[PDB]
Design an enzyme around this catalytic site. Sequence first.
Site, PDB file in Angstrom:
ATOM      1  N   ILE B  38       0.868  -1.171   0.000  1.00  0.00           N
ATOM      2  CA  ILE B  38       0.000   0.000   0.000  1.00  0.00           C
ATOM      3  C   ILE B  38       0.907   1.223   0.000  1.00  0.00           C
ATOM      4  O   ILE B  38       1.421   1.629   1.049  1.00  0.00           O
ATOM      5  CB  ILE B  38      -0.958   0.015   1.195  1.00  0.00           C
ATOM      6  CG1 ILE B  38      -1.918  -1.172   1.124  1.00  0.00           C
ATOM      7  CG2 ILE B  38      -1.739   1.318   1.244  1.00  0.00           C
ATOM      8  CD1 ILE B  38      -2.907  -1.222   2.261  1.00  0.00           C
ATOM      9  N   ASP B  39       1.120   1.807  -1.177  1.00  0.00           N
ATOM     10  CA  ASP B  39       1.873   3.046  -1.273  1.00  0.00           C
ATOM     11  C   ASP B  39       1.190   4.148  -0.468  1.00  0.00           C
ATOM     12  O   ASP B  39       0.010   4.060  -0.120  1.00  0.00           O
ATOM     13  CB  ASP B  39       2.015   3.472  -2.733  1.00  0.00           C
ATOM     14  CG  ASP B  39       0.730   3.293  -3.518  1.00  0.00           C
ATOM     15  OD1 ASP B  39      -0.223   2.703  -2.967  1.00  0.00           O
ATOM     16  OD2 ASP B  39       0.669   3.738  -4.683  1.00  0.00           O
TER      17      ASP B  39
END
Lengths: 50, 90
Positions: B38-39
Amino acid sequence: PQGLSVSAEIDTRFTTHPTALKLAAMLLAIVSTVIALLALWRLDRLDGRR
Amino acid sequence: AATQEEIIAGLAEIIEEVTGIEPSEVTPEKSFVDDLDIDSLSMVEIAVQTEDKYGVKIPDEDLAGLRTVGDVVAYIQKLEEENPEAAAAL
């Protein structure tokens, strides 16, 4: 001879250039646009994220 | 005070809407970037949709210090136990 003449008239209707009014109205629809965009950006920056 | 199993259950339903990760992966020992990919451009969306459901403004001053789900549950727990002004009115 005298009296002999043939006078046509070319249809140069696409060869125009704007006046001072149409230029002052063109250079004023681009400044207010970016001013409104900057104001909307300043309003969006209320959430405190940079 | 909000239980851990409801904090995680409320965070998983947002993670599943934003990214699509099944809520069976959200455990209190998963990192937000290594295990769950999850950037931070999705962490911003999670922090926006969090406030758009429960009024909670997580500032980017603190959005960087959350590396695991345990950090999230600890942050929420401490902020809800500090301030007694938690409305919780839907």
